[PDB]
Write a protein that binds this ligand. Structure first.
Ligand SMILES: [Cl-]
Ligand SMILES: [Cl-]
Ligand SMILES: [Cl-]
Lengths: 396, 399
């Protein structure tokens, strides 16, 4: 079993190829986010009169495969320019091998911070810095460079060529789609939730910069969006940009409530089962994640469901001086990646001295409607109904 | 399927049975600690002249199995006493079903906090509270109750019966060994690392109370230790007590260094590979835990290896942030469960995080760990000499 590689001419004029590798070996993106669905690395080649322009690259463990694939569509000795929109090694790891294969000087183009990172990572010193809005005539065509910082590093930019946007992480998603582009509706619908997962896990801390970036790109006429991961968008690139904006804003789906809890011995479970049944009774559709002694949800899946939730509900055990370690971890990641102005209910056990969840959420945009104590024998089921009814009233 | 259940007479004078169930369904103890090896729940029955004393129980999902097994060695209606050394539901979950099966009042013995927790968990109210050192004559024998608080809850006590200590979590371990007791040396040797894993994960926050508890029990002649999880110790209970104390004190195994790192892209891995080679060249035997894009260690296994390490070495990815999620979780759990005065080396990438973010070093600095140096993880121009300097500094500190 070898990774699937796509090499296809995607435009006739300008003459543009994609080189895409489907990474089905990776398990944890950035060594953290669970992606059993995989991720692609997409690089591009523009073949012109007097220039051949490589745009981005592949992860470094696939450097040999990249050189071999590239060599089927151009002599590497004839590459003249390499554009690096973002220097993170999932997109730049093949660059040292590429430069060695080319075997002579080439013009490397990056943002100001990108130049600093290429020096730090790889010792590459001969880098041309492009400034915001700068245009460069290469091979008879106008390339325009637009800085879109903090999507998700300070080095990030997008390259515009006659309406075609090479955007690297901007517009990426997880998943290995069965086609290259947005030409099939069923594929698009299956893909978009993996775009949401990518946005929150990779970009979520910087989600306000998605809004700034989309506003900046709105001044360009975009015919196609060619990102570094996932589908290419030739039919309807605005649909992808709209989805990015919707996730960044946290636009909710009516009725959706995400319920996250730990249960050690069934006490939290007993309360949360009743809360979930009450949600359904009242017309909501819960999405449930339970940390138990047999089950351990993926944090990337929890995070994916936050942006379009109308509300969140947490069930928390106290543990030593604080709260259950996996609920601590989950809350810290939600705060870091998915800090939205949404209502929350907390159900909690009292500890030896359960203010922790509120302290964690204090400096966030979430608003806790109520805290309800999880008791054992003498639990008052009416207080569960009270809390769900309060949430329903808040969302009317 | 049905778990393995053991029911065996383990003493004749007095007549004592163990009822042990091997939980091969559980995956995460306390819904957090990875235990592919499983854990047993051990309860005991003491049959005396005029009394039948049940000591502890099984987790609640096995309550039906517990009643059926108990009924093979005694008519439950003839039970007169239940001793609850600790109320956590892995040991007490079968109690409500047991009381219903008995069908009449029994004397339930617990600590003061134990009584409070039995009411809160189960609504059980008629509980006899025993104080520290209290003795009670039951069935012609003296039962002595010794409070051992915070091992690992405020309710914890141990029951001493003429040299036999029923200790519940105190002296427990993970693993489902192929025999009941400590009579096979190869089993004991394979078992003890799973005892260390149990100590750190369950009791580690309160390891100072292990030392206090051991001191308290040292005035008693202990001929056997019968815990709530794992092996029973009839041949050499002092070996187990010494192990608990050694783990609590963090007695190191010479040459052992534990190396823990996250490599987001491979730059940390390149430096840590060189650090590991240098450790080996200087005579150390590293144990290595790597978070990468393809592999993820169990946090319970990291924690198990801390107590007998001479030192820890951390490799920390930063870039946009000072501490990433898995190394944050790991560091916070080491601080919570395995907070020892041991030397540490930190290797870390120089990132661009906002200055107000806590660094990995600043966090470790709060603790008993002693950071000997910080070494920058660089890319192409990394100076191997700086790696060797750090390992040499560690060797100087450790001898
Ligand atoms: Cl619980
Ligand atoms: Cl954490
Ligand atoms: Cl790295």
């Amino acid at each position: 079993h070898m990774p699937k590689i796509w090499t296809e001419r995607i435009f006739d004029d300008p003459e543009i190829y994609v080189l895409r590798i489907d990474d089905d070996r990776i398990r944890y993106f950035e060594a953290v986010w669970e992606i059993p669905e995989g991720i692609s690395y997409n690089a591009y080649l523009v073949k012109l009169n007097g220039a051949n322009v490589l745009i981005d690259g592949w992860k470094g463990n696939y450097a040999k495969e990249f050189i071999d694939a590239l060599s089927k569509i151009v002599d590497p000795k004839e590459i003249t320019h390499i554009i690096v929109n973002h220097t993170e090694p999932d997109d730049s790891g093949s660059l040292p091998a590429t430069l060695k294969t080319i075997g002579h000087d080439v013009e490397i183009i990056a943002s100001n911070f990108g130049k600093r990172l290429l020096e730090g990572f790889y010792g590459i010193k001969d880098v041309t810095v492009v400034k915001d809005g700068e245009e460069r005539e290469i091979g008879g065509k106008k390339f325009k460079f637009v800085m879109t910082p903090w999507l998700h590093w300070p080095d990030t930019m997008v390259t515009y060529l006659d309406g075609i946007l090479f955007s690297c992480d901007v517009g990426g998603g997880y998943l290995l789609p069965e086609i290259l582009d947005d030409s099939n509706e069923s594929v698009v619908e299956r893909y978009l939730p993996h775009v949401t997962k990518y946005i929150v896990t990779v970009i979520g801390h910087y989600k306000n910069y998605i809004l700034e970036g989309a506003e900046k790109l709105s001044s360009l006429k975009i015919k196609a969006l060619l990102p570094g991961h996932g589908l290419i968008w030739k039919k309807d690139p605005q649909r992808l940009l709209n989805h990015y904006v919707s996730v960044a804003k946290g636009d909710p789906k009516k009725g959706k409530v995400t319920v996250i809890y730990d249960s050690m011995y069934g006490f939290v479970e007993n309360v949360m089962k009743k809360a979930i049944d009450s949600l359904k009774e009242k017309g909501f559709t819960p999405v449930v994640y339970k940390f138990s002694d047999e089950e351990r949800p993926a944090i990337s899946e929890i995070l994916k469901d936050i942006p379009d939730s109308e509300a969140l509900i947490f069930g928390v055990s106290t543990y030593e001086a604080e709260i259950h370690p996996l609920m601590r971890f989950t809350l810290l990641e939600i705060i870091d990646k998915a800090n939205y102005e949404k209502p929350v209910l907390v159900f909690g056990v009292h500890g030896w001295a359960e203010r922790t969840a509120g302290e964690l959420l204090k400096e966030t945009k979430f608003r806790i409607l109520s805290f309800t104590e999880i008791k054992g024998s003498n639990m008052d089921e009416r207080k569960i109904e009270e809390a769900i009814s309060l949430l329903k009233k808040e969302l009317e």
